[PDB]
Structures are given as C-alpha cells and as structure tokens.
C-alpha cells in the first residue's frame, strides 16, 4: 500500500510521525507491504519551494493510494497573496483528486464521556459519520449576487452530484453498521424533495442497508437528544457543514477527531486540528487525530476494517491509561503513542 | 389591554383558562384594564361554522390588541381539504397580521437542569430568545423548480426584509439583556454579507444594545457548548428553523415553552405543545407553556415587563413546588395553577 505523507507545519511532523510507527507497527504484524515517501506541503512548501503544493507533490499524490496528512497553516503565511496560501494549496489538493465526499466522524470513547457537553447518560455509546457533499449546493450555486437592494444564492443539484456522494454513504455504512440517514427538508424545498427521491432510487442497490430520511431541522434536535442512534448520515453541502460542527461538539474535544475526503481520485485523511506553532518540538502534542486518521485510511482506502477497529480500540485504551495532556494527563506524544503499540498486539 | 382569546382544541381551552386565571390576578393587583373575548378557531370552528378561521373571529383579532391561541389540530380533521384545515386556519392568522417574526425562547428554569440533554454546569443559566425571519428567504424564494435532472431553490433577502426582523430584535432586546447576535453565513454567501451589512446598518439607531454577528455553523456549535453566553439571537427563515428547533430542546421539555409572532398587526402568542386530545377534559394537562404565552404577551404585545417576568418567576417556582406529571409530579392542571397564583403576590 503506497502512502504519501504531507507532514505539514507546526505539530504537523510529530504527529505524522507518531502515526506512521504504528502503521509500520502493523506492517510488520500483517506484512500490510506498506511503501510511504513524504513530501513538501503548506509552510514549509512555501518556505522551500514559493508554493504550498508543489509539483513534486502533486505527483506525489498523484502516484500514491492515499494521502496521510499532517497539519498546515501558521501566522507565518496568514499575511501573503491568497493563490500561495497553506489553505490554498490544501484546497488545490482536493481539486486535483476531484475529492467530492467530506467523512466527520464523532464518537464518544468510553470511559470519556465526562468530556462531551452532554449528559452520561446521552453522550454514551455515540459513534456518527456525518458524509457532506463537497462540491455543490449553495456555497458553489448560480445565479448568485448582490446589490444595494437585494441578494440572492441558489441552492442547487443535479441527479450526479446527489447519486455519487450518497454511495460512498451506503458503501461506508457496508463498513459499520449498516445503517444510513439521508438529511434534506424536501417537506419545503423542491431541491430536498428531489435530494429525497434520488438517494430512495440509488438505495435499491444497497439491500443491505437500512436507510432513513429526516429533516434538517428534526436532524438538529435528534444529534442533541439521542446522538448515539445515528450510524452514517448523507447530506448536502451547507446541511452537512453545519451538521458536521454539531456532531463535533459532542466528545468534548476537537482534539481527538480525524476527517477524510473521498472521490474519484487519491483520498486524503487528515486530522481536524490546527498547526499549532507554539508547540511544535516541544513533544506533548496529542497525536490521537493523526493516528485516527491512519485508522481511517485503513478502513476507507484499503478496506482493511478489522485492522482500523484494532488501531480504533488500542487509542481508547491509550486516552484512559496515558491521557495526553489536553485530557488532563501529562504523556507526551512519544509516551502516548507507545501505549497505543502496547494495545496494538 | 384587549385580549382575543382563540382556545382551540384538545387541552386548548383547559390550558388557556390557566392563562386567563393568572391575567385575570394581575388584573385586579394592577388593574390593567384587562378586557378579552374567546372566539372558536380550530376544529372546533371547522365543526361549528365550516371553516377554522371564520370571520367574527377574524374580525376580533383585528379588534384587539393581542392574541392569546391555546391548542389547534386532532386526529378528526387531518383527513380534510387542506384549504379548511385548522392548521390552515393557523397560516391565515399570521397572514391577515402581517406577523414577520416568529419569538421562540429556551430557558432552563433554576432547579431543573436535571431535565436537559446537557450537563447541569452547562444547561445553567440559559436563557435564550431565537427571532427568526418567516416572510422571506428560500422557502419562499423564486426562481424555484424541479426536473428530473435537476432541482433549484432560491435563498433571497431585501433589505426591508432583513431591516423589519433586525428591529424586532433589537426592541425585543432592550427589554432582556440588551445584547443581539446576527446569525449568518457572510463567508460565503452573498445573502449573508448583505444580512450582515444591514443588520450592522440597523443597529446604529440602538446604541444601548450590543450586537454581534456569528456563522450558522459556529453558533450550532455554541448553543450545545456555551449557550448560556447568549440573549437575543436572530437570523434567516431556514438559519432560525434550525436553530430554533436545536435550542428547543435544551430544556428537555417541550410542554413548557411558549411562541410569540411579532408584526405589523395583532400579535399572536402560543404554547409550542400540540393538542394532545386524548387528555382532553381529564384535567391533567400542564399548563406553563399557556401561561408563559401571557407572560410572553404582557412584554412584547404591552411592554408589562416587569409583570412579565413576575409571572416567570411565578411558574418557575411553582415547577419546583408542584411539578406537573410531565416532570414526574401528579399536580393537575388546577393545582399548578393554584400554586403560580400562591407567588403572584
């Protein structure tokens, strides 16, 4: 399995690293034939080359199975032209690989409920994969505009965009537990309605698997109330952002959570959290995220599910044996990392 | 004060005359001037005279100075020509009104933190008033269609639109906290610029309120983490449904929250709860959402807002003292009552 490894700026290498020891760890496990090469990206792309994804890099990426990435950004970069921005390259990235599918999973580890805003009692058992749909809908709609009067978006999709992003949904439900929630407001809108109709015709392929419709609205109340009877959720572009922001709250730390983008080109998994600069070097960053997303690469670039379970189950155990710092404990990534190996067998 | 009292169905007219019990109280501790009529509204008009809005009912809330609706809807008349139904009858209401604000408060009572989905140290304190814009946006934006290729909606805002809720809020804050929040999506969407921009605009002639603008997403995000932090918020039509529904449920009970919608004619204030019929008569029925849609009624429809929060003190002591059955308590309708009277004076 080839991987292209994009460390990044700030915490990015510590913690990228901390994940490829145990994606080594595995390899010598299983003999996974894991081949990775790592090159320039955001920061340090910029600092070295005058762009945050250079060619090298594409092709990089281009070549690779999938893309481990580790964290990019810095006040360094925040005052330069935006087409050299770390945050423009990241977004060139998705292009290239015509990534139109964004995996957000929340879940709430057990024995870590204290953490999450909700009550125990609620905030138990709680393991959400919301899917959005990355490259329609408002946010991209036309026409669209504005005047001293007036201001008008368009929310709009085509049979397509809908069909291909609801079955990385169901295939990924396939992985868990088979069970998918379609998000629309097709009781109002006609876009929902007919969001409503083709992800109802592209299930009849999937006879596996359960599938649900809800409203926005009703969806918003339900993630609050009982989070932990949801599996996999679809949805659009600005249903999904938002949807995504909610469900994130509910472990209680922004920490600890992975993302994927999925399409027809190399997937990219990356950690949620920022750069942050001030800690770079110092050890103590926690490379949970890093390792979660290694974790999903397992299970959604190469299907290799009960392997990202093992690597799921070991970074449980590890948060409650060795807490990083951030979870009230004080293991540096190293100590940290070294406990989820000791799970890992 | 003139009072058009439309009861409605199922626990409507029990629920209602809690309400009128305490107004009535007030009334000769204040002498207010209280004068109000009951008019048949609801499944009760559709069996009485055909239709659920008929006109001397029309002609009464055009008379008055407020509304007072209890509970309309029932098994009986779901199964009838949408034009003659008492939901219908409800739509026509706001209509003949001009109301272009929909009021939904969430508050979590002292003392019964227990009851919501959050933990006790976050749901403490909130108290929290959604405005959301009902006129306008893209459930009601054109262009609009649907084909078997492609749907579109239309999200479209004028600024009269946006300058009418934005001022609703701003009086509506000066009689709380004196502090707004703009909810929108401005970095993105050309409407949310604008939303902003004008709402900036308005805000220049309320010098005594604070306003702060927040994107969509984030502040899903802080009505689950931090939602005690916030006042008055308002926003767009499908933004304000969301969030009105996400902050519904904070309390952890929808039998105690009321609704108030605010316009250019009578203002209409109502308990959120449906009719729940098969209760009808026992007695039973808790009647907070009813007599906080008065309380709600003396401060937006009269400006009594000391009355107001007077009788919001009143229930809030009364949960804690006689719970209604809903909170595990066995008190009926009448004791409830008895008991917010006990603390009106």
Not at 253 to 271: D, I, Q
Not at 277 to 301: C, F, Q, V, Y
Request: charged share 25%; net charge negative.
């Amino acid at each position: 399995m080839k991987v292209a490894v994009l460390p990044g700026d700030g915490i990015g290498p510590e913690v990228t690293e901390a994940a490829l020891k145990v994606l080594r760890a595995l390899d010598e496990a299983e003999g996974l034939g894991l081949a990775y090469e790592v090159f320039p990206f955001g920061g340090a792309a910029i600092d070295a080359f005058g762009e945050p994804f250079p060619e090298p890099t594409r092709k990089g990426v281009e070549e690779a199975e999938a893309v481990l990435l580790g964290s990019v950004g810095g006040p360094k970069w925040d005052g330069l032209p935006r087409k050299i921005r770390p945050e423009t390259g990241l977004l060139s990235l998705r292009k290239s690989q015509d990534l139109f599918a964004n995996l957000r999973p929340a879940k709430v580890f057990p024995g870590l409920e204290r953490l999450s805003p909700l009550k125990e009692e609620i905030a138990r058992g709680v393991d959400v994969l919301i899917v959005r749909e990355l490259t329609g809908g408002i946010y991209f709609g036309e026409p669209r505009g504005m005047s001293e009067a007036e201001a008008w978006n368009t929310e709009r999709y085509s049979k397509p965009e809908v069909e291909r992003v609801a079955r990385v949904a169901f295939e990924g439900a396939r992985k868990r537990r088979k069970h998918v929630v379609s998000v629309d407001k097709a009781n109002v809108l006609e876009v929902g309605e007919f969001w409503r109709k083709t992800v109802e015709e592209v299930g009849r392929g999937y006879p596996d698997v359960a599938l649900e419709h809800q409203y926005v609205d009703a969806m918003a109340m339900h993630l609050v109330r009982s989070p932990a009877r949801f599996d996999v959720v679809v949805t659009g572009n600005i249903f999904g952002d938002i949807l995504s922001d909610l469900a994130s709250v509910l472990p209680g730390s922004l920490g600890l959570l992975p993302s994927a983008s999925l399409g027809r080109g190399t997937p990219v998994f990356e950690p949620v959290h920022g750069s942050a600069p001030d800690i770079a070097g110092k050890g103590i960053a926690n490379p949970t995220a890093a390792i979660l997303s290694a974790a999903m690469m397992l299970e959604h670039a190469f299907g290799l599910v009960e392997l990202a379970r093992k690597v799921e189950d070991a970074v449980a155990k590890a948060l409650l044996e060795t807490p990083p710092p951030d979870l009230g404990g004080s293991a540096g990534t190293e100590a940290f990392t070294a406990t989820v190996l000791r799970h890992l067998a």
